[PDB]
Design an enzyme around this catalytic site. Structure first.
Site, PDB file in Angstrom:
ATOM      1  N   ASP A   1       0.770  -1.260   0.142  1.00  0.00           N
ATOM      2  CA  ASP A   1       0.057   0.046  -0.059  1.00  0.00           C
ATOM      3  C   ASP A   1       0.907   1.150   0.088  1.00  0.00           C
ATOM      4  O   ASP A   1       1.705   1.503   0.920  1.00  0.00           O
ATOM      5  CB  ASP A   1      -1.019  -0.074   1.326  1.00  0.00           C
ATOM      6  CG  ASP A   1      -2.242   0.800   1.012  1.00  0.00           C
ATOM      7  OD1 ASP A   1      -1.982   2.029   0.451  1.00  0.00           O
ATOM      8  OD2 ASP A   1      -3.342   0.249   1.051  1.00  0.00           O
TER       9      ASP A   1
ATOM     10  N   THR B   1      -6.913   3.561  -2.298  1.00  0.00           N
ATOM     11  CA  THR B   1      -6.663   2.271  -2.061  1.00  0.00           C
ATOM     12  C   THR B   1      -7.742   1.357  -2.719  1.00  0.00           C
ATOM     13  O   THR B   1      -7.363   0.346  -3.236  1.00  0.00           O
ATOM     14  CB  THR B   1      -6.375   2.024  -0.386  1.00  0.00           C
ATOM     15  OG1 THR B   1      -5.278   2.711  -0.267  1.00  0.00           O
ATOM     16  CG2 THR B   1      -6.212   0.590  -0.327  1.00  0.00           C
TER      17      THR B   1
END
Ligand SMILES: *[C@@H]1O[C@H](CO)[C@@H](O[C@@H]2O[C@H](CO)[C@@H](O[C@@H]3O[C@H](CO[C@H]4O[C@H](CO)[C@@H](O)[C@H](O[C@H]5O[C@H](CO)[C@@H](O)[C@H](O)[C@@H]5O[C@H]5O[C@H](CO)[C@@H](O)[C@H](O)[C@@H]5O)[C@@H]4O)[C@@H](O)[C@H](O[C@H]4O[C@H](CO)[C@@H](O)[C@H](O)[C@@H]4O[C@H]4O[C@H](CO)[C@@H](O)[C@H](O)[C@@H]4O)[C@@H]3O)[C@H](O)[C@H]2NC(C)=O)[C@H](O)[C@H]1NC(C)=O
Ligand SMILES: O=S(=O)(C1COC1)N1Cc2cnc(N[C@@H]3Cc4ccc(Cl)cc4C3)nc2C1
Ligand SMILES: [Ca+2]
Ligand SMILES: [Ca+2]
Ligand SMILES: [K+]
Ligand code: NA
Ligand SMILES: [Zn+2]
Length: 805
Positions: free
Chosen positions: A121, A159
């Site tokens: 991430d 995300t």
């Protein structure tokens, strides 16, 4: 309600999710507060940590330990990842030389090389260079495998939209995860990071890789991990699944790290606190690779190391407040931060007016750090409009900034130094791709590519047929040693007519005039040869575009340009011309300012007319082939044919005229000649696809002349600029744009200045892939090159980004 009285005995990290009220033992049970009572005790052991030590080597198995150093651990598949290093004098994988993997070297019973997706991430592209000293395992995957300098995420660069795009090959507008926060007005429901609504399957469209695999008989690991499962436990669970019996063992797996995003928000992308997270991720990759080496799978598995987005410097003090622009700020709902989405607070407020909100947000402060758009006017490369979850009003926020409704929103909720979500062409938002394994290439750099392409490649790696998606299957074949996908060009659906001279001047009653009454056997023959296509090889370098839908059109040849003229839309679908490095720019002569000439090859019934343009007080016209680039005064007359004319707002003609008069010659100078293909686009329903005639919302007043929503150009030259565009032996170079056909220049805050100060800036924002134009026109370009089709597919996906290094 969950009966948590059940047990995870023999069920830890089970792959099939069980039905409530039955208690769960899978890697998401914690996220649903549904785990059996004994999940922590049985499934999240921590005793003695994650590393074998010399004193543990050959120990009596203790089932309480997090991992094992007993002789039986390799057969149980539950050794600490460093077991063979500590206890059997083996090397860490990172200390072994890179050795080409030409074929899978798999244990007996493996039907295909497994795929492991290692997803990180917030891993910004430049971490691969800036963090290289502290990431030796990642640097070995990168240098020995196949890597891109960066991978372009989708917009918004958040995300959930990017991880679901990786899974589906779809744009957010199509998969439906259009942000990390959403309101669906058909469900009347809200999706958020915190809470249960996001687990409802109705939000999640298309077909993700784990479903594509399962439907085609390929078993998948569960991709999602509850945050409290430590990374070491995720790795050991993958390695234990890889030790399952052949009939039970998945072929595709995903690891996920919340880092470095979590730290990046707190400290900024290059905060000194960012070193340790990168070290820890590197150590995790090391645990996976050592673990694979222990199971004799390190020359068997394909590993993908991939990020969802990058990370930008963003602080509380760089916030714009709509309360400083709007009178009415309490009557709106803002989805805030690194993008803005505005809707009415109440659907019962009949005084809500989007027009008045856009106007109050347009070029109000000299350095304003966001730009309002109706969503259909956003750059087409973002593909961010065709979804009821995307509000009509969008704010594109400058990099390094936030937008919020009112100041109190910022300090009744400074903390953070990093954020992401901005335009997916911004350098700070770019992320990473590495492929390593028998199916990837060895020590190979590939050009940057979009994350929408990876679903197809993951399907290739697993022998799956992909669900319908937005990738261009074949465009990433150059990443792969084997399992390439070898597509056939689409079949042309409509064949062109090649009309000759069929109409006398007096048959046309178009309201047009032209001072062209100016009267020789040498040059009579030449004019005729030009109209039969004698120069077509110079101007149509890559073949004519194929028309992939049912329609009626004519090929029209001229000295300086070739066109595909639609009898249905009464204008060219495409106009193709080549401008050499040596080309001369000339003027529109005063005697031809208002010149429009009937085309004696095309019926009056299939022509535009000048009287409609005179009657329509908002709409003017322009030309697709620029009169400014005529090869000769005589050839210039061709450029004023009614078949080269298209509808243009005066505000657009300012852009178009500067492009045609100044920029085309500039690009021919810089690139050693260019080939240009220009044309209209109609996308009144903002779906990114060619409109049918019955979808057109605007016509030139009193006529059947449809008004384009956009104008494209595709500008092609030799990648080896020492060769001229028209005599290029090797690979091509392309840049393209899709310019919005708007009645004002409100998008360009500096449009009162000379075109040299704002037109190029506008065209850079509206950069496009050839593939984007293909979707919008139903045309198929580059049909006749002497390049590999996969190479052409790569070219068709290229985006010219105009970001420095
Ligand atoms: C990127 O790649 C994707 C994938 O290839 C491309 O998207 C496809 O585009 C097609 C054209 O827009 C579209 O085809 C339509 O499908 C309808 C059937 O749809 C359902 O079934 C499929 C298959 O399983 C499924 O994928 C769909 O999923 C969508 O919808 C649900 C919504 O509940 C979402 O959860 C999911 O996220 C996804 O949403 C996205 O697509 C929809 C459109 O379907 C958008 O509205 C959303 O915003 C979001 O973008 C569905 O579950 C089918 O019924 C349609 O057929 C009508 O139109 C044709 C036109 O030829 C007409 O001839 C037919 O007669 C029919 O007309 C009738 O219905 C009309 C509309 O109600 C009505 O006006 C008429 O009068 C008639 O009654 C159509 O074939 C396909 O579904 C999507 N798929 C996906 C996954 O998005 C996308 O184009 C690519 N992008 C680019 C830029 O290239
Ligand atoms: O809530 S989060 O956004 C985030 C944590 O705090 C903010 N969140 C939790 C979580 C857990 N597991 C995963 N696994 C990913 C999903 C996915 C999709 C495509 C591909 Cl190719 C691989 C993977 C593996 N991803 C996430 C994202
Ligand atoms: Ca993320
Ligand atoms: Ca359309
Ligand atoms: K007019
Ligand atoms: Na302006
Ligand atoms: Zn984040």
């Amino acid at each position: 309600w969950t009966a948590t009285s059940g047990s995870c005995k023999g069920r830890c990290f089970e792959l099939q999710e069980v039905g409530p009220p039955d208690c769960r033992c899978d890697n998401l049970c914690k996220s649903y507060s549904s785990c059996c009572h004994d999940f922590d005790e049985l499934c999240l052991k921590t005793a003695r940590g994650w590393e074998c030590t010399k004193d543990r080597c050959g120990e009596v198995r203790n089932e309480e330990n997090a991992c094992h150093c007993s002789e039986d651990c390799l057969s149980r598949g539950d050794c600490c990842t460093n077991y063979q290093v500590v206890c059997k004098g083996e090397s860490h994988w990172v200390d072994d030389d890179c050795e080409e993997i030409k074929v899978p070297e798999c244990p007996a019973g493996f039907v295909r090389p497994p795929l492991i997706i290692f997803s990180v991430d917030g891993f910004r592209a430049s971490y691969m260079k800036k963090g290289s000293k502290v990431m030796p395992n990642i640097e070995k995957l990168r240098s020995c495998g196949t890597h891109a300098p960066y991978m372009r995420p989708v917009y918004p660069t958040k995300t959930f939209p990017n991880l679901y795009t990786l899974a589906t090959g779809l744009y957010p507008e199509s998969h439906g995860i259009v942000g990390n926060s959403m309101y669906d007005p058909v469900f009347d429901a809200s999706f958020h990071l915190r809470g249960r609504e996001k687990f409802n399957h109705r939000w999640w469209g298309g077909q993700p890789l784990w479903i594509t695999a399962t439907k085609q008989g390929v078993r998948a690991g569960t991709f999602f991990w509850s945050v409290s499962i430590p990374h070491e436990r995720r790795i050991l669970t993958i390695l234990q699944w890889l030790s399952l019996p052949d009939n039970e063992r998945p072929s595709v797996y995903a690891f996920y790290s919340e880092q470095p995003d979590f730290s990046g928000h707190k400290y900024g992308p290059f905060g000194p606190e960012m070193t340790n997270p990168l070290r820890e991720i590197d150590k995790t990759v090391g645990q996976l690779m050592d673990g694979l080496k222990q199971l004799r799978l390190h020359r068997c598995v394909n590993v993908i190391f991939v990020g969802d987005h990058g990370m930008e410097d963003v602080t509380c003090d760089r916030t714009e407040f709509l309360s400083n622009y709007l009178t009415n700020v309490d009557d709106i709902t803002l989805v805030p931060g690194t993008l803005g989405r505005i809707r009415a607070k109440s659907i019962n407020n009949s005084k809500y007016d989007p027009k008045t909100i856009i106007a109050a947000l347009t070029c109000k402060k000299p350095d304003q750090h966001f730009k309002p758009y109706m969503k259909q006017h956003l750059p087409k490369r973002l593909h961010y409009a065709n979804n009821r979850r995307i509000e009509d009003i969008h704010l594109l926020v400058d990099r390094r900034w936030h937008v919020a409704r009112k100041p109190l929103d910022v300090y009744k909720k400074c903390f953070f130094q990093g954020d992401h979500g901005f335009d997916n062409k911004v350098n700070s938002m770019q992320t990473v791709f590495v492929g390593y394994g028998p199916t990837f290439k060895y020590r190979t750099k590939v050009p940057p590519f979009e994350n929408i392409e990876l679903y197809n490649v993951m399907c290739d790696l697993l022998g799956l047929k992909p669900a319908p998606n937005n990738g261009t299957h074949g465009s990433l074949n150059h990443l792969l040693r084997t399992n390439t996908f070898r597509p056939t060009m689409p079949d042309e659906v409509s064949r062109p007519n090649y009309p000759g001279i069929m109409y006398l001047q007096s048959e046309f009653d178009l309201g047009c005039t032209c001072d062209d009454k100016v009267e020789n056997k040498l040059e009579e023959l030449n004019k005729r040869l030009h109209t039969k296509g004698s120069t077509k090889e110079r101007h149509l370098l890559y073949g004519r575009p194929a028309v992939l839908y049912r329609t009626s059109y004519d090929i029209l040849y001229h000295t300086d340009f070739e066109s595909g003229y639609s009898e249905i839309f009464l204008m060219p679908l495409w106009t193709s011309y080549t401008i050499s490095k040596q080309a001369e720019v000339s003027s529109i002569p005063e005697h031809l300012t208002n010149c429009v000439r009937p085309d004696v090859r095309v019926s009056p019934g299939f022509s535009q007319n000048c009287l409609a343009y005179k009657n329509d007080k908002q709409m003017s016209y322009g030309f697709l082939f620029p009169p400014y680039l005529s090869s000769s005064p005589e050839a210039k007359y061709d450029a004023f044919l009614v078949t080269n004319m298209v509808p243009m707002y005066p505000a657009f003609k300012r852009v178009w005229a500067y492009f045609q008069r100044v920029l085309v010659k500039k690009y021919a100078s810089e690139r050693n000649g260019v080939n240009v293909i220009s044309g209209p686009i109609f996308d009144y329903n903002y779906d990114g696809l060619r409109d049918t005639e019955d979808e057109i919302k605007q016509y030139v007043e009193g006529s059947s002349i449809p008004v384009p929503t956009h104008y494209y150009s595709i500008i092609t030259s030799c990648l080896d600029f020492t060769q001229p565009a028209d005599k290029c032996d090797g690979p091509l170079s392309v840049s393209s744009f899709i310019l919005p056909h708007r009645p004002d220049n409100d998008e360009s805050c500096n449009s009162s200045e000379d075109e040299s100060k704002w037109v190029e800036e506008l065209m850079k924002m509206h950069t496009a892939r050839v593939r984007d134009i293909e979707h919008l026109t139903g045309l198929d370009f580059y049909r006749k090159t002497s390049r590999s089709y996969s190479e052409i597919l790569t070219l068709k996906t290229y985006l010219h980004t105009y970001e420095s290094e």
